[PDB]
Amino acid sequence: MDTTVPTFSLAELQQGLHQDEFRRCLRDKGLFYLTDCGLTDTELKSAKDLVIDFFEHGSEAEKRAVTSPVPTMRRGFTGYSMCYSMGTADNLFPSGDFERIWTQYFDRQYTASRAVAREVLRATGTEPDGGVEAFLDCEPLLRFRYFPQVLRMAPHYDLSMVTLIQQTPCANGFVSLQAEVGGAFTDLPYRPDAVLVFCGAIATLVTGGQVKAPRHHVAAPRRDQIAGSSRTSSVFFLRPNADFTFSVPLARECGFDVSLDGETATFQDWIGGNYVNIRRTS
Amino acid sequence: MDTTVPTFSLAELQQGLHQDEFRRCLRDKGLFYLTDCGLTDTELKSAKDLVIDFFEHGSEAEKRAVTSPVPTMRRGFTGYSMCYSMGTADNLFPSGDFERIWTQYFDRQYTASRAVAREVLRATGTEPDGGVEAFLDCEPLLRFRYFPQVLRMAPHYDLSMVTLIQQTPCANGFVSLQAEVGGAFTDLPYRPDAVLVFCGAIATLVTGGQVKAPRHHVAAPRRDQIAGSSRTSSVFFLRPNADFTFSVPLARECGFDVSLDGETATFQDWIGGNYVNIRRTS
Amino acid sequence: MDTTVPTFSLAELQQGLHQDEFRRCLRDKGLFYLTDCGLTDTELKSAKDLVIDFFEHGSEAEKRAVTSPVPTMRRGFTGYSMCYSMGTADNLFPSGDFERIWTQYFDRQYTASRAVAREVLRATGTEPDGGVEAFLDCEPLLRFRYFPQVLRMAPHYDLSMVTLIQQTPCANGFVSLQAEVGGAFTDLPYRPDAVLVFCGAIATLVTGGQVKAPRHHVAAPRRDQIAGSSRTSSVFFLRPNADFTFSVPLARECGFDVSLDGETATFQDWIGGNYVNIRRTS
Ligand SMILES: O=C(O)CCC(=O)C(=O)O
Ligand SMILES: O=C(O)CCC(=O)C(=O)O
Ligand SMILES: O=C(O)CCC(=O)C(=O)O
Ligand SMILES: [Fe+2]
Ligand SMILES: [Fe+2]
Ligand SMILES: [Fe+2]
Numbered sequence: 016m017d018t019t020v021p022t023f024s025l026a027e028l029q030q031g032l033h034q035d036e037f038r039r040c041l042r043d044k045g046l047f048y049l050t051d052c053g054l055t056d057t058e059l060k061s062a063k064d065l066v067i068d069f070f071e072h073g074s075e076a077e078k079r080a081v082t083s084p085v086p087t088m089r090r091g092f093t094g095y096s097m098c099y100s101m102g103t104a105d106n107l108f109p110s111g112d113f114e115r116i117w118t119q120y121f122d123r124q125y126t127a128s129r130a131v132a133r134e135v136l137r138a139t140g141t142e143p144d145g146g147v148e149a150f151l152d153c154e155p156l157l158r159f160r161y162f163p164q165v166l167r168m169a170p171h172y173d174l175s176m177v178t179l180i181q182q183t184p185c186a187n188g189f190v191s192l193q194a195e196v197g198g199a200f201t202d203l204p205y206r207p208d209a210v211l212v213f214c215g216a217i218a219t220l221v222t223g224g225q226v227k228a229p230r231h232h233v234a235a236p237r238r239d240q241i242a243g244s245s246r247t248s249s250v251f252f253l254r255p256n257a258d259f260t261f262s263v264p265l266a267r268e269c270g271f272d273v274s275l276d277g278e279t280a281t282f283q284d285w286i287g288g289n290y291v292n293i294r295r296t297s
Numbered sequence: 298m299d300t301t302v303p304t305f306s307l308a309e310l311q312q313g314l315h316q317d318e319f320r321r322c323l324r325d326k327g328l329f330y331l332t333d334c335g336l337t338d339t340e341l342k343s344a345k346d347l348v349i350d351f352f353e354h355g356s357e358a359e360k361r362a363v364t365s366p367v368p369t370m371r372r373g374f375t376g377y378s379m380c381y382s383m384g385t386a387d388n389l390f391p392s393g394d395f396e397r398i399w400t401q402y403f404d405r406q407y408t409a410s411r412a413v414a415r416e417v418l419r420a421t422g423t424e425p426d427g428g429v430e431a432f433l434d435c436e437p438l439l440r441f442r443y444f445p446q447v448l449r450m451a452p453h454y455d456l457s458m459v460t461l462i463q464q465t466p467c468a469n470g471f472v473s474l475q476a477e478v479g480g481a482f483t484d485l486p487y488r489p490d491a492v493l494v495f496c497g498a499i500a501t502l503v504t505g506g507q508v509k510a511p512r513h514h515v516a517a518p519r520r521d522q523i524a525g526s527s528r529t530s531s532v533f534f535l536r537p538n539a540d541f542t543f544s545v546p547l548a549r550e551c552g553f554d555v556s557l558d559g560e561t562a563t564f565q566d567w568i569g570g571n572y573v574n575i576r577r578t579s
Numbered sequence: 580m581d582t583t584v585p586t587f588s589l590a591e592l593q594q595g596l597h598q599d600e601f602r603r604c605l606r607d608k609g610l611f612y613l614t615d616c617g618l619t620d621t622e623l624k625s626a627k628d629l630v631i632d633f634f635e636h637g638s639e640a641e642k643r644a645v646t647s648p649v650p651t652m653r654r655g656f657t658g659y660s661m662c663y664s665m666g667t668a669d670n671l672f673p674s675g676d677f678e679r680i681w682t683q684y685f686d687r688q689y690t691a692s693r694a695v696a697r698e699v700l701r702a703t704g705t706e707p708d709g710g711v712e713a714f715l716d717c718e719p720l721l722r723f724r725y726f727p728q729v730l731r732m733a734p735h736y737d738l739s740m741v742t743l744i745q746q747t748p749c750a751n752g753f754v755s756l757q758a759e760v761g762g763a764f765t766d767l768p769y770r771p772d773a774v775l776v777f778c779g780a781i782a783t784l785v786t787g788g789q790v791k792a793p794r795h796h797v798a799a800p801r802r803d804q805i806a807g808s809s810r811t812s813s814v815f816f817l818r819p820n821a822d823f824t825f826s827v828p829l830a831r832e833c834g835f836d837v838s839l840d841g842e843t844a845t846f847q848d849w850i851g852g853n854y855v856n857i858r859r860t861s
Contacts, residue, residue, distance in 0.1 A: 016639060043643065075298060075480055079325065083552030084509045085501045086454055086578045090552055093578060094480055105550050156554070172650055198639055198658055219649045227648045257558040268669050270647030270654055272720070272854045274847050276821040283556050285852040288567040290554045296650045296657060357580060357762055361607065365834030366791045367783045368736055368860045372834055375860060376762055387832050438836070539840040565838050570849040572836045 018197035022048040022209055025127065028134045038138050038225075045214035045227030046194055048206055049179075052127040056207035059181050062120040062159070063247060069109050070097045070161050081107035088158060099159045124179055125155050128253040131212055132177050139225040144260040144279075150221070151176075153256050156292070159249045165241035167191060168233035171293040174286070175215030179251040182211075185236070187243030194231035203231075216271075216294070217255050217282075224269030230296065252292055257283040300479035304330040304491055307409065310416045320420050320507075327496035327509030328476055330488055331461075334409040338489035341463050344402040344441070345529060351391050352379045352443050363389035370440060381441045406461055407437050410535040413494055414459050421507040426542040426561075432503070433458075435538050438574070441531045447523035449473060450515035453575040456568070457497030461533040464493075467518070469525030476513035485513075498553075498576070499537050499564075506551030512578065534574055539565040582761035586612040586773055589691065592698045602702050602789075609778035609791030610758055612770055613743075616691040620771035623745050626684040626723070627811060633673050634661045634725050645671035652722060663723045688743055689719050692817040695776055696741050703789040708824040708843075714785070715740075717820050720856070723813045729805035731755060732797035735857040738850070739779030743815040746775075749800070751807030758795035767795075780835075780858070781819050781846075788833030794860065816856055821847040 021040050023033060040047050069077075069092075081091040088100050091107030101121050108114035129151045136147055143150035153176070182192065184205040193200040194213070203211055218226040236244045259282040263275045266285075275284060303322050305315060322329050351359075351374075363373040370382050373389030383403050390396035411433045418429055425432035435458070464474065466487040475482040476495070485493055500508040518526045541564040545557045548567075557566060585604050587597060604611050633641075633656075645655040652664050655671030665685050672678035693715045700711055707714035717740070746756065748769040757764040758777070767775055782790040800808045823846040827839045830849075839848060 016643075042648075045648075078480065079298075084324075084327075084506050085498050085552040086510070086512055087552045087554050088578055089554040154556075198642065216649050224648050228650070230650055257556045270649040270651045272651050272653040273852055274718075274821045274850060274854050275852050276845065276847055280852065281558065283558055286556060287569050287851050288555055288557050288562065290556050296652055360762065361580075366606075366609075366788050367780050367834040368792070368794055369834045369836050370860055371836040436838075539838045563840065565840055568838060569851050570837055570839050570844065572838050 016043065016197045018199070018201060020044070020046060020048065020194075020196060020201060020203065022050060024051040025049055025130055025134070026051040029130070034138060037134070041135060041138065041214060041218075041226040043227065044196055045218070045229040046196070046231075047212055048209040049127070049131055049212050050209045052130065052210060053123050054127055054181065054210050058120060058123065059183070059249065061116055062249070063183060065113050065116050066099050066159055067161060067247070069099075069113070073109060077109060081109055083107070089156065095163060097161045101157045102155060121157055124157060124249070124251045125253075127210065128155060128177055128179050128251055131179075132218075132253055135177065135214065135218055135226060136221065139222040141222045141225075143221050150255065150259065151253075154254045154290070156252045156254060156290070157249065159247065161247050162245055164244040165236065165238070166232055167235050169295065170195075170230050170232040171295050172228045172230050173213055173215030173252065173293055174217065174291055175213075175252040175254055176217040176221070177253050178213040178215055179253075180211045180213065181249040183247045185240075185244050185246050187236075187240050189236045189240045189244055191233045191236075191246055192231065192248070193234055194229050196229070200232075215252075217259075219269060220261055220266060220271065223265050254290060254292075255282050257281060298325065298479045300481070300483060302326070302328060302330065302476075302478060302483060302485065304332060306333040307331055307412055307416070308333040311412070316420060319416070323417060323420065323496060323500075323508040325509065326478055327500070327511040328478070328513075329494055330491040331409070331413055331494050332491045334412065334492060335405050336409055336463065336492050340402060340405065341465070341531065343398055344531070345465060347395050347398050348381050348441055349443060349529070351381075351395070355391060359391060363391055365389070371438065377445060379443045383439045384437060403439055406439060406531070406533045407535075409492065410437060410459055410461050410533055413461075414500075414535055417459065417496065417500055417508060418503065421504040423504045423507075425503050432537065432541065433535075436536045436572070438534045438536060438572070439531065441529065443529050444527055446526040447518065447520070448514055449517050451577065452477075452512050452514040453577050454510045454512050455495055455497030455534065455575055456499065456573055457495075457534040457536055458499040458503070459535050460495040460497055461535075462493045462495065463531040465529045467522075467526050467528050469518075469522050471518045471522045471526055473515045473518075473528055474513065474530070475516055476511050478511070482514075497534075499541075501551060502543055502548060502553065505547050536572060536574075537564050539563060580607065580761045582763070582765060584608070584610060584612065584758075584760060584765060584767065586614060588615040589613055589694055589698070590615040593694070598702060601698070605699060605702065605778060605782075605790040607791065608760055609782070609793040610760070610795075611776055612773040613691070613695055613776050614773045616694065616774060617687050618691055618745065618774050622684060622687065623747070623813065625680055626813070627747060629677050629680050630663050630723055631725060631811070633663075633677070637673060641673060645673055647671070653720065659727060661725045665721045666719060685721055688721060688813070688815045689817075691774065692719060692741055692743050692815055695743075696782075696817055699741065699778065699782055699790060700785065703786040705786045705789075707785050714819065714823065715817075718818045718854070720816045720818060720854070721813065723811065725811050726809055728808040729800065729802070730796055731799050733859065734759075734794050734796040735859050736792045736794050737777055737779030737816065737857055738781065738855055739777075739816040739818055740781040740785070741817050742777040742779055743817075744775045744777065745813040747811045749804075749808050749810050751800075751804050753800045753804045753808055755797045755800075755810055756795065756812070757798055758793050760793070764796075779816075781823075783833060784825055784830060784835065787829050818854060818856075819846050821845060
């Protein structure tokens with residue numbers, strides 16, 4: 016195999032170009048960069064600038080007013096690092112300016128996520144139980160995370176349908192995010208023109224095993240690079256509804272070690288009553 | 298904010314004094330010391346002395362006779378540390394003397410726990426589904442843990458309604474337990490006259506978000522203090538029944554990242570079929 | 580107590596010999612070596628040789644063709660170590676030669692596992708809900724794991740009915756696997772003539788507390804032994820069906836900290852929708 020992490024334009028995919036290349040990427044890799052999806056570096060910088068302004072300049076009192084009473088990182092602020100989370104509703108916003116910027120940014124991401132998911136399902140000939148549009152009108156979670164200088168994040172796969180990741184780079188050039196491609200870890204650097212997409216385990220489940228869910232982690236710099244090593248990431252998880260229904264025997268055929276009686280099950284039956292975003296192979 | 302960990306007398310709370318102070322503590326802090334609740338240092342020493350006598354002087358055979366066949370730390374003895382656990386029934390007791398002392402101590406703790414929980418629910422105007430008394434007649438767990446000298450315990454929040462903690466101090470004066478208060482970790486030292494109460498996630502859930510569940514951890518001494526660094530803690534978790542029922546949309550409003558179809562759910566639906574006492578934000 | 584890890588011949592057990600010795604082993608230890616069960620070193624070497632030939636000599640492409648799209652270690656190959664997994668169906672085999680050898684080896688293990696489980700249930704007078712044979716016609720998982728040189732595996736107990744383990748030895752003589760026996764960790768070395776059996780938590784549950792589920796872990800060599808320290812293990816888990824049904828109050832009597840409403844429950848109710856193989860006491 017070529018272990019190159021490919022790039023696809025969403026616009027060309029939506030026109031039916033590169034079908035074989037895409038299908039083969041999904042099955043053998045499960046990850047790719049995505050251009051022409053409505054997501055520019057400019058916007059990433061509008062949103063990143065206002066949130067980082069809050070991480071740095073927001074009072075204790077202002078942070079408290081947008082902190083959930085249980086510290087789940089589902090909505091609002093969570094303070095060696097800081098996080099800002101959002102979904103389609105129940106959001107906590109520091110101000111009217113933040114809210115316009117972050118609502119627009121969320122929506123752009125949720126649109127791109129749905130749009131690439133529709134292409135994954137089309138490329139694999141997949142009609143989810145309940146149909147495509149009800150499957151994609153779901154329960155996404157957006158987490159933006161600022162990381163200070165000196166693994167960083169242990170290897171896992173995602174339990175999303177897809178995950179979209181926009182990063183800003185280490186000022187000193189270190190590349191933190193890596194994924195397993197062809198049996199070894201490959202760099203996944205920042206690209207101002209593109210978003211990284213990871214397929215998660217739900218893509219594998221829904222498509223009956225036609226899409227890989229790759230393992231990935233976040234590396235630590237060599238101490239020779241422990242100045243200029245901070246970074247941010249925007250991680251958008253497209254997560255199915257609780258009532259997403261799948262075939263139990265088909266789940267079994269593609270590696271899922273389910274303990275489910277009977278022939279069909281829901282996402283809730285499988286994962287339980289709280290979203291679980293990531294999983295270790297261990 | 299004043300980041301002082303407040304103290305309340307249960308007796309004054311039960312007389313309706315300090316209502317605003319208490320409500321504001323619950324919402325902004327989720328933790329406090331509690332005096333006048335039936336829990337003296339003297340008793341803590343009666344119970345601690347007999348169990349430590351067992352940790353030290355009980356035979357292998359005697360420990361085996363009060364060890365569960367699965368090592369869950371639910372009931373009896375568990376052997377870098379030792380634990381003694383109890384609930385309302387199915388207990389394992391080393392002897393008739395231990396049993397009287399530990400039954401009385403359990404009951405005192407379970408009484409105080411219920412009594413402070415009733416005040417939390419009253420201060421927030423909360424009527425659990427099924428009413429207050431059936432909610433508080435629940436499934437508590439008491440764990441007493443002896444820790445040897447050289448984190449100790451990673452940061453988490455509790456999934457209890459409330460947790461009551463009685464500690465004995467490090468002979469060398471180090472303060473191991475800390476909690477997040479006002480965005481930073483604050484010491485929670487021993488107080489012979491008071492118990493520490495942590496609100497857990499069930500308090501947040503039941504009250505619709507009026508109570509914080511704070512993160513806390515147990516620190517390690519600086520090696521300059523790795524003689525005289527042993528300690529014990531008595532941790533009493535007030536845990537709801539499996540059939541505790543709550544509103545799904547309300548859960549969502551207060552930060553809980555539930556994957557629950559439909560409008561109501563039970564504690565079992567949310568957490569699954571085994572009690573889970575604590576959780577990481579990660 | 581004698582903290583010796585005992586050995587039983589399955590053939591003598593099946594003839595009703597050593598009943599008291601076996602019962603007392605199950606209750607106080609939960610672990611033993613097993614001879615005369617159809618499992619020779621010769622076979623272990625037929626299977627180990629072909630899989631190690633694949634770990635070393637199989638192409639990237641060949642490994643990919645027997646890698647599941649989600650990296651669960653349920654079936655096929657998983658690449659600091661490599662694993663090969665199998666069950667009763669949905670297997671991924673590198674070739675017709677591997678398949679004959681591994682099918683036969685699986686089946687031998689599944690036979691021995693069932694046969695010792697039947698003896699455990701008989702020795703304790705246990706009739707599972709739904710009867711013995713439907714209980715033992717279950718959902719086993721076989722994992723073969725090659726470990727390179729420099730804990731290795733953290734302490735846990737198994738959630739199996741029984742687990743059978745065949746190891747090959749460290750060329751330098753170090754003994755990696757240990758279990759808690761009589762309150763301390765005891766070596767469990769390779770024995771060409773025997774398999775190690777661990778009782779798991781399901782044995783404890785089904786038998787109403789007559790069998791211990793011991794904790795065990797895998798130790799690291801002293802750096803004085805970090806050449807010749809690689810090893811392999813074949814771990815066979817006998818895991819109940821999702822619909823295995825047990826008594827909730829009885830579960831509670833033997834240490835299980837269940838959050839289950841009502842009087843009976845299924846394995847799925849307790850553990851959820853994915854198999855969980857092992858558990859920490861923590
Ligand atoms: O921070 C990153 O780039 C990756 C984060 C990630 O994989 C996750 O949150 O799942
Ligand atoms: O040992 C302590 O003081 C705290 C223990 C704790 O937070 C717990 O068991 O949840
Ligand atoms: O590798 C070994 O010998 C033990 C493995 C083990 O206990 C397990 O996979 O549960
Ligand atoms: Fe991830
Ligand atoms: Fe705690
Ligand atoms: Fe194990």
